[PDB]
Design an enzyme around this catalytic site. Structure first.
Site, mmCIF file in Angstrom:
data_model
loop_
_atom_site.group_PDB
_atom_site.id
_atom_site.type_symbol
_atom_site.label_atom_id
_atom_site.label_comp_id
_atom_site.label_asym_id
_atom_site.label_seq_id
_atom_site.Cartn_x
_atom_site.Cartn_y
_atom_site.Cartn_z
ATOM 1 N N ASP A 69 -7.068 7.880 -0.725
ATOM 2 C CA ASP A 69 -6.517 6.897 0.181
ATOM 3 C C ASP A 69 -5.468 7.548 1.107
ATOM 4 O O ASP A 69 -4.654 8.364 0.656
ATOM 5 C CB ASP A 69 -5.874 5.799 -0.639
ATOM 6 C CG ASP A 69 -6.853 5.110 -1.561
ATOM 7 O OD1 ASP A 69 -7.974 4.765 -1.138
ATOM 8 O OD2 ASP A 69 -6.455 4.813 -2.680
ATOM 9 N N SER A 72 -12.454 9.988 -4.352
ATOM 10 C CA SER A 72 -12.035 9.595 -3.016
ATOM 11 C C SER A 72 -10.523 9.721 -2.917
ATOM 12 O O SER A 72 -9.840 9.849 -3.919
ATOM 13 C CB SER A 72 -12.485 8.167 -2.720
ATOM 14 O OG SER A 72 -11.800 7.226 -3.528
ATOM 15 N N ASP A 126 -13.173 8.392 -8.825
ATOM 16 C CA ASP A 126 -14.368 8.462 -7.969
ATOM 17 C C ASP A 126 -14.312 9.563 -6.913
ATOM 18 O O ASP A 126 -15.198 9.668 -6.083
ATOM 19 C CB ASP A 126 -14.735 7.091 -7.373
ATOM 20 C CG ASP A 126 -13.925 6.747 -6.140
ATOM 21 O OD1 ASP A 126 -12.876 7.381 -5.917
ATOM 22 O OD2 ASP A 126 -14.402 5.903 -5.340
ATOM 23 N N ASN A 181 -7.883 9.469 -5.992
ATOM 24 C CA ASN A 181 -8.496 8.645 -7.026
ATOM 25 C C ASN A 181 -9.434 9.536 -7.811
ATOM 26 O O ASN A 181 -10.598 9.756 -7.431
ATOM 27 C CB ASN A 181 -9.289 7.489 -6.408
ATOM 28 C CG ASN A 181 -8.432 6.619 -5.519
ATOM 29 O OD1 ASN A 181 -7.443 6.032 -5.983
ATOM 30 N ND2 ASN A 181 -8.783 6.539 -4.235
ATOM 31 N N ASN A 232 -9.458 4.233 2.496
ATOM 32 C CA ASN A 232 -10.198 5.072 1.554
ATOM 33 C C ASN A 232 -11.295 5.902 2.207
ATOM 34 O O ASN A 232 -12.014 5.426 3.085
ATOM 35 C CB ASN A 232 -10.793 4.199 0.445
ATOM 36 C CG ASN A 232 -11.415 5.009 -0.669
ATOM 37 O OD1 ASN A 232 -12.621 5.234 -0.683
ATOM 38 N ND2 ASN A 232 -10.598 5.419 -1.633
ATOM 39 N N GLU A 235 0.797 -1.203 0.000
ATOM 40 C CA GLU A 235 0.000 0.000 0.000
ATOM 41 C C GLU A 235 0.844 1.273 0.000
ATOM 42 O O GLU A 235 0.532 2.227 -0.724
ATOM 43 C CB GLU A 235 -0.961 0.020 1.169
ATOM 44 C CG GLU A 235 -2.052 -1.033 1.072
ATOM 45 C CD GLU A 235 -3.060 -0.805 -0.051
ATOM 46 O OE1 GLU A 235 -3.094 0.271 -0.658
ATOM 47 O OE2 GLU A 235 -3.865 -1.712 -0.283
#
Ligand SMILES: [Cl-]
Ligand SMILES: [Cl-]
Ligand SMILES: [Cl-]
Length: 130
Positions: free
Chosen positions: A53, A51, A49, A46, A60, A35
């Protein structure tokens, strides 16, 4: 901060991650490695969408923490996403535990399926005293 491998392993062990809902420490290590490279301060947007992380587990914003700016989102960890960018990973660990209380468990993270699932992950904890 960027953890060293064995430092992180011990840190997660103290925080009760070893075997949490069936998940070995080496699995949590493999997840953090892929990650974030063990980096607490990482964010990744991102564009697809809207969002983001956050942090060492790249948790998220759509489901797990509140950043104010993700449309339609909820905050199941009941934390500001800011909490997931601390050097102290207690809040991140609590939130990771929350994720894996849901049916998918650790499969929630695609990187885990890609990089960890069905692999020999023993190397992540070798020599760490855990
Ligand atoms: Cl396993
Ligand atoms: Cl918070
Ligand atoms: Cl901190």
């Amino acid at each position: 901060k960027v953890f060293e491998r064995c430092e992180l392993a011990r840190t997660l062990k103290r925080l009760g991650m070893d075997g949490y809902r069936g998940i070995s420490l080496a699995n949590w290590m493999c997840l953090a490695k892929w990650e974030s490279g063990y980096n607490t301060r990482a964010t990744n947007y991102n564009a697809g969408d809207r969002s983001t992380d956050y942090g060492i587990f790249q948790i998220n914003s759509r489901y797990w923490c509140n950043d104010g700016k993700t449309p339609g989102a909820v905050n199941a960890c009941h934390l500001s996403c800011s909490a997931l960018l601390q050097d102290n990973i207690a809040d991140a660990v609590a939130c990771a535990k929350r994720v894996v209380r849901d049916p998918q468990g650790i499969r929630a993270w695609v990187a885990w399926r890609n990089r960890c699932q069905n692999r020999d992950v023993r190397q992540y904890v070798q020599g760490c005293g855990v």
